[PDB]
Design an enzyme around this catalytic site. Sequence first.
Site, short mmCIF file in Angstrom:
data_model
loop_
_atom_site.label_atom_id
_atom_site.label_comp_id
_atom_site.label_asym_id
_atom_site.label_seq_id
_atom_site.Cartn_x
_atom_site.Cartn_y
_atom_site.Cartn_z
N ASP A 54 -16.75 38.26 -36.14
CA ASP A 54 -16.80 37.00 -37.11
C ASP A 54 -18.23 36.07 -37.17
OD1 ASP A 54 -14.56 35.90 -39.17
OD2 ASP A 54 -13.58 37.09 -36.97
N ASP A 70 -7.72 35.57 -36.96
CA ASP A 70 -8.84 36.22 -37.95
C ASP A 70 -8.10 36.02 -39.43
OD1 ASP A 70 -11.46 36.88 -39.00
OD2 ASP A 70 -10.54 37.56 -40.02
N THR A 102 -11.97 33.37 -44.65
CA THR A 102 -10.77 33.69 -43.91
C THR A 102 -9.58 32.39 -44.09
OG1 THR A 102 -10.97 33.77 -42.14
CG2 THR A 102 -10.97 36.01 -43.43
N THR A 103 -9.59 32.48 -42.81
CA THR A 103 -8.00 31.21 -42.28
C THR A 103 -8.47 29.68 -43.25
OG1 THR A 103 -8.83 31.84 -39.87
CG2 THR A 103 -7.30 30.06 -40.15
N1 LIG Z 1 -15.42 23.22 -32.27
C1 LIG Z 1 -14.99 22.37 -33.32
N2 LIG Z 1 -15.21 20.94 -33.58
C2 LIG Z 1 -15.06 20.75 -34.89
N3 LIG Z 1 -14.37 21.58 -35.79
C3 LIG Z 1 -14.43 22.97 -35.79
C4 LIG Z 1 -15.11 22.94 -34.23
N4 LIG Z 1 -14.91 25.11 -34.44
C5 LIG Z 1 -14.26 25.32 -35.41
N5 LIG Z 1 -14.07 23.84 -36.43
C6 LIG Z 1 -13.86 23.59 -38.03
O1 LIG Z 1 -12.22 25.12 -37.65
C7 LIG Z 1 -13.32 25.37 -39.10
C8 LIG Z 1 -12.57 27.05 -38.73
O2 LIG Z 1 -11.43 27.49 -38.44
P1 LIG Z 1 -10.95 28.41 -37.64
O3 LIG Z 1 -9.88 28.64 -37.74
O4 LIG Z 1 -12.55 29.44 -36.94
O5 LIG Z 1 -10.49 29.50 -39.17
P2 LIG Z 1 -12.55 29.90 -40.13
O6 LIG Z 1 -13.15 29.58 -39.45
O7 LIG Z 1 -11.55 31.56 -40.22
O8 LIG Z 1 -11.19 30.05 -41.56
C9 LIG Z 1 -14.55 25.39 -38.89
O9 LIG Z 1 -14.94 25.58 -40.44
C10 LIG Z 1 -14.55 23.53 -38.70
O10 LIG Z 1 -13.97 23.30 -40.16
F1 BEF Z 2 -10.06 31.90 -38.53
BE1 BEF Z 2 -11.42 32.12 -38.39
F2 BEF Z 2 -11.22 33.88 -39.44
F3 BEF Z 2 -13.08 32.32 -38.15
#
Ligand SMILES: Nc1ncnc2c1ncn2[C@@H]1O[C@H](COP(=O)(O)OP(=O)(O)O)[C@@H](O)[C@H]1O
Ligand code: BEF
Lengths: 537, 528, 519
Positions: free
Chosen positions: B393, B54, B87-88
């Site tokens: 989340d 997160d 966030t991320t």
């Molecule tokens: N299954 C996936 N396949 C393609 N893109 C994905 C997938 N899962 C998450 N993503 C991409 O990564 C983003 C989420 O990043 P994440 O590491 O979860 O950090 P955060 O969601 O907190 O920003 C999603 O909004 C999308 O852009």
């Molecule tokens: F990596 Be995030 F907070 F979904």
Amino acid sequence: FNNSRSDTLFLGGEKISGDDIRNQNVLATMAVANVVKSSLGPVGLDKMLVDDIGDFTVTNDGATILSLLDVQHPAGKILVELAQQQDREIGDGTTSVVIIASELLKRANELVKNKIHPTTIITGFRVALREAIRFINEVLSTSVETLINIAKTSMSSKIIGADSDFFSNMVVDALLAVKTQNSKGEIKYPVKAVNVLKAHGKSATESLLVPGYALNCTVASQAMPKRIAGGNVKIACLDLNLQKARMAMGVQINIDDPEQLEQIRKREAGIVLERVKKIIDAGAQVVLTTKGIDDLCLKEFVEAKIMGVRRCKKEDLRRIARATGATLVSSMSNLEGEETFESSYLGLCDEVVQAKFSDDECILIKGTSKHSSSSIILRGANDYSLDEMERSLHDSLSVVKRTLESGNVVPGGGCVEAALNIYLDNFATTVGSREQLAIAEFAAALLIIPKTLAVNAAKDSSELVAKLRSYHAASQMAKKRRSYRNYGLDLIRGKIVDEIHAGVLEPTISKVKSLKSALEACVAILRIDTMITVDPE
Amino acid sequence: KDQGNKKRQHGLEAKKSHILAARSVASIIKTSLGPRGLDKILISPDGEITITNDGATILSQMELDNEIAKLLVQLSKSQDDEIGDGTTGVVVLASALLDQALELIQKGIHPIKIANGFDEAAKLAISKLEETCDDISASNDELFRDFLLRAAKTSLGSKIVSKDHDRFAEMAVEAVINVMDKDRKDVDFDLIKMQGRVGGSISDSKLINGVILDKDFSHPQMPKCVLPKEGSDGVKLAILTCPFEPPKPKTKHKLDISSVEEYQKLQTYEQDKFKEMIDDVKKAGADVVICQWGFDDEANHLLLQNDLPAVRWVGGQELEHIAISTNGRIVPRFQDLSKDKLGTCSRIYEQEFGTTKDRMLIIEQSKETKTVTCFVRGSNKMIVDEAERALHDSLCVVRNLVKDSRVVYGGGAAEVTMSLAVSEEADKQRGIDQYAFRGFAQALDTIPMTLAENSGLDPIGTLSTLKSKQLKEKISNIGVDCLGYGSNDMKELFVVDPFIGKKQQILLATQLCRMILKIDNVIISGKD
Amino acid sequence: IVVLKEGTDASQGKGQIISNINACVAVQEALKPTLGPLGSDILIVTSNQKTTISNDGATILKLLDVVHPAAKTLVDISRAQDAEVGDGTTSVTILAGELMKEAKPFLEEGISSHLIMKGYRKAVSLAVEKINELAVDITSEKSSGRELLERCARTAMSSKLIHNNADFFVKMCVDAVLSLDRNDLDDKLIGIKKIPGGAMEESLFINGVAFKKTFSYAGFEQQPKKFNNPKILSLNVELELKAEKDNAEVRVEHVEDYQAIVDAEWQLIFEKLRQVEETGANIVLSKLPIGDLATQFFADRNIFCAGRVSADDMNRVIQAVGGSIQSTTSDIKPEHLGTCALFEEMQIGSERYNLFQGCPQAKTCTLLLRGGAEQVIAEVERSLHDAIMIVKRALQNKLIVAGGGATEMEVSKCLRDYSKTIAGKQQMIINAFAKALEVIPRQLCENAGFDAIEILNKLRLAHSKGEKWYGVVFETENIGDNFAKFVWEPALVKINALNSATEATNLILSVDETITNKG
Ligand SMILES: Nc1ncnc2c1ncn2[C@@H]1O[C@H](COP(=O)(O)OP(=O)(O)O)[C@@H](O)[C@H]1O
Ligand code: BEF
Ligand SMILES: Nc1ncnc2c1ncn2[C@@H]1O[C@H](COP(=O)(O)OP(=O)(O)O)[C@@H](O)[C@H]1O
Ligand SMILES: Nc1ncnc2c1ncn2[C@@H]1O[C@H](COP(=O)(O)OP(=O)(O)O)[C@@H](O)[C@H]1O
Ligand code: BEF
Ligand code: BEF
Ligand SMILES: [Mg+2]
Ligand SMILES: [Mg+2]
Ligand SMILES: [Mg+2]
């Protein structure tokens, strides 16, 4: 407030850039200048500068004040080395070449804050000077007494000035009498002859001007005469010492037979004794060695009532000899022989006497064959005032050596400044642009000398500065009627007067170098935009 | 004042510093953006070890003194507050932007004029997205349930939870449906107890249609479970905030006792007084008692003999969920009982736990109450504590979908549609705003590129493909093959990010930029 | 061997006056960048550790600590400017300083300060009247009632972090100066609220009033969280069983009396409690607590509540639903209560917010602010107070002048022209002040990059040669009619500015000896 940090660019030291440094420089030059801005003009005054031991010295020579005042910082040293240049070059004008410099930076800087590139300001000041130097030759003139005048006005901001008339005269007099031709023509006035001396006692006015020279020594053995010749004397300006020889540094006397011991021995005394005789035997009544005398080889002069002085100042003998026509005897030789050559090397002097001065008592070689020479001897309350009397007797007597060598003077009194000001100021529009502001600043800046020359009188100097301003501003209207620049300040009374008439003269050669120079500094500093200060060891 | 211990920065350096400081915060968390991302062990100065993908959580834990970072700390935080999933990413985009902004600066551009450039190009992208987005609520009911889930899932792929992402997703989908209404579209998270305990694996993390709480059940002899009491309407339970002890004043006391007379009456006063309560609850006709404050030895025993399982001491939020879960009323005094203010729950049992001498209890309901309890379990603290925030989340992305059924297909494509549209308008811009628009769109490209970098794909490569494909066809949604599978097209692949959030994100970064850039002067002091 | 002060520094002389000037210049040059539409901004991290970022020159000069007597007046005149006006704070100092700067030449050349003081004195008088003389009063002179408040809250909201989201906030700003009685504009009613997170413009304008959520008790979650026209009871005190405070002693010698006094306590509460129920209310608020039992009660009979409401809040609550605080439950008459158009308990920025929106009968609004960082929300609230406060002083004085250097540049003209007729000392001094005003136009150009020299100089021609509102075309870098371009600011600024700025300037030029005591 306060600059700090680093982050990237890891440098072994300090480094200020832009505004920060550019202001620091200006502040620096400013301070070093402001210390001596209270010493400018006749109404200006001297200061006492005490050390750590507690002793001190009081002096108005801007260059010595800035020298004596410990300055640490580039732009500070710069104006202390620029104040130096003057005292080294022309000889007076120190206190002022700095006040100008500071004013040029201070000002030029303001332009940059207005968003005006440094170069565009620089070229601007450069042209303001071209025009200003040219114009300076349109206020000056050939020597047409201008001398006793130059020598006087150069004693206004000094201690010697309360007795201006006196010294102003003794100055020119003393100098003149020493003139020579150097090599192939020339006719230069000795930038250093006229051995000046000082002794505490009597009035400030009771300063004597010897009619010859003053060598500062006694008479070796108290046994010889203290006054010789009334008509004519033969002076032996030596250099080689009359003491018991020691042979070559690598000449071992190896004795194999006890016989030779005594002989070669006493020979030593005589070898340098013969040298003595071959000199008395020349009509030598007065001997001035440089490398000292033995007490043995002295008794020879004594037994013969020959005034013989030990280890003299070689910087004097060189001038004591050109003054008696004699010859600085390096070593009696010529081809392959040995003699001081009777009167061939000797000098003709009228009289050699050892005059006293309370506590002290020195020798005088007054009246000589080809001397022409002089030498002054100050007398004051104590060393504190005395050092300074001379200190400024020099900063004055120097103004003369240059008025002479360069037949050309300009009216001081802050006139030159005012003139250039309004001329360059109006001339400033002959280019317009941003560049106008430059010349404008340059010109405007020059009014520092007239303002501060007067502010040193406490009264609201905005008066004179305004009048003198207006005048020139007007005079250059048919510059026609009866054109009258040369109008300076008369702070003693508080009104604008004609300085050429009044007697306020200053050599062109000063204000011409004082100007070309002070800018050469301001520019090299105007280009400074980052000051990296390495860490020392 | 305090001239010393006070530093100053301004542009030449300054801006580099800040820009770089951002960039660096970024470089750490970039390796955590993606379903191929990785977590970061953070340690409290006390010694507390956490592990979590997160964004916000990470940057909050990094005890850091750089002022610009301190800002990105909140940037990821604020976003977590408003959406719960950005966030991320929000920081990544922000940094990229800064590097970009800076780059231009050394070419003669004004920092504040770049600002306005970015704000503009941004507003545009927000629109080019607000137009391409799709809708869910207004389309179907069984498909809403599906889409709403297909988001919760995508929202979990970058978490340890991923392992059992089927369950954790359908759990978050449910947990929200059950406490927010289609009309108000308001998910109050007080109505969802996110409680977790250790044991089993993360798989044994179920959802409870009631609440949990920790209780030994007042008296040991008491039963362990509670039947619906023969043919009744489920189970009825007492929900009282009055202590099973002799009533006392609330102003003074000093019950002066002149003689054996009155002391004789007090004697029998407390005695039957305990019957005055034990009876009172029996009268309302209840099965089990849930009292906010403890009972006396006597009063307890009676609750035993009278087959009245009890729950000594139950916190505010506690007692309150037991109400809303069982449809009851929080009864003050004792005489204020009644068969109609009781709790109509569906069961009560004292839950065992390995050999842990704790052994809490639970209150079920069968039918979707107005209170859910996601009860998380794991093989070790960190897995749990992460899996809880991982659950959270998703629960948030489910809330955002009711508050704005709009959805955009992520996988990076969502950010490519902007970069594409925003870059187009660049050519028309020309001059100074041309550099800005190019920049804004260019920073954006780092988002998908980073996904490629983490999933093992050549950045420039996937970008050209994602851009070409999403142009040679339609400014749609063609994402990065983050995991593999056939090909791009987040649609088939079922990769979805709620629009409402994405906007917020692509704003929060540009705005934060817009602040930093306007800073041309800095003055820090120390801690005297 | 004797002394007269115990080692306690004290400087005097002519330099003393010059030190002070330069001292002030520093604190001055400090703010110069935060000027103009394209103005730079500062980031101060006080020894406090609280990090701030702003442009309210007052707020900056307040965080600089500053201890130099002289230079510390620039901190004072900047504070007053944010009072009697509310805007221009940045500039009052730029000028105040700049004058002291232009006084250096005289003070140095050797002129009395009492003369420079006089010179500047007239200069202000003339300059002040000139503004009054240009203060374009309007009402429907092709300006409208709203387009004045908008056109003025706009230009002033420029050069602040809140800029590129201008329209949103000016429409918001004006709407909130109007929310209160235009007969007595009291800021204390526009009570602002800050909410962690969100876009720096996802901010909300509540029509009625909005406040925290002090609702700290069990039994909540019941009680509807939304009503349309509820019957608001702006009550002032208590609602707890045993009472939140105050007591007495109960002494009884009879067992029955004990249980008796108990039943009394209870009934004593419940009564006062139903007494509220009796008022037939839907929303019960109190600046004091609402115990577990209490809030539990209303919860049962679908009545909403909140205990311990912010003091400055109930007063905005009254002014919204038109209630009227009540201390006891007894004589509760119905003109006492209040009612809004709509009540709801939001979840804005992960924080529940009770808010009574929609209230056509209000004299007090509330507005929640958003941002990605506790620094930006903070800067908005200050960037907005500078606007609201300028809209307010533009109702009370429909007199306006076109800034953007114009007003400043023009007041120079007449002042420079006047000096011709004077000649002498007073000439230069009064002509100085004239040039000294050029700092605002000057700096304004340097900050943004425009050719400070040419744009200034080109302005002086045209402006003095006619166009009494020529300033600077923020757009195509060039001079222009700022009145036509609609760059308006009430004259109330400039007039207070030059008055108060000069004050500082002569206060400093008046001091010849500064004696700092040590201890
Ligand atoms: N299954 C996936 N396949 C393609 N893109 C994905 C997938 N899962 C998450 N993503 C991409 O990564 C983003 C989420 O990043 P994440 O590491 O979860 O950090 P955060 O969601 O907190 O920003 C999603 O909004 C999308 O852009
Ligand atoms: F990596 Be995030 F907070 F979904
Ligand atoms: N008699 C005088 N009346 C007015 N000014 C004078 C007079 N005497 C010297 N000056 C001026 O004073 C300045 C020289 O004074 P001083 O302070 O000694 O400068 P410096 O030390 O550089 O020579 C020059 O401007 C010179 O013209
Ligand atoms: N839109 C604009 N165009 C030109 N000048 C403006 C504009 N907006 C405000 N100004 C001017 O900028 C100066 C105000 O600077 P600002 O940074 O707003 O600080 P303060 O208003 O607190 O002095 C004034 O001269 C004002 O007239
Ligand atoms: F002091 Be100055 F050089 F005559
Ligand atoms: F900075 Be000001 F108050 F507009
Ligand atoms: Mg001199
Ligand atoms: Mg996510
Ligand atoms: Mg303003």
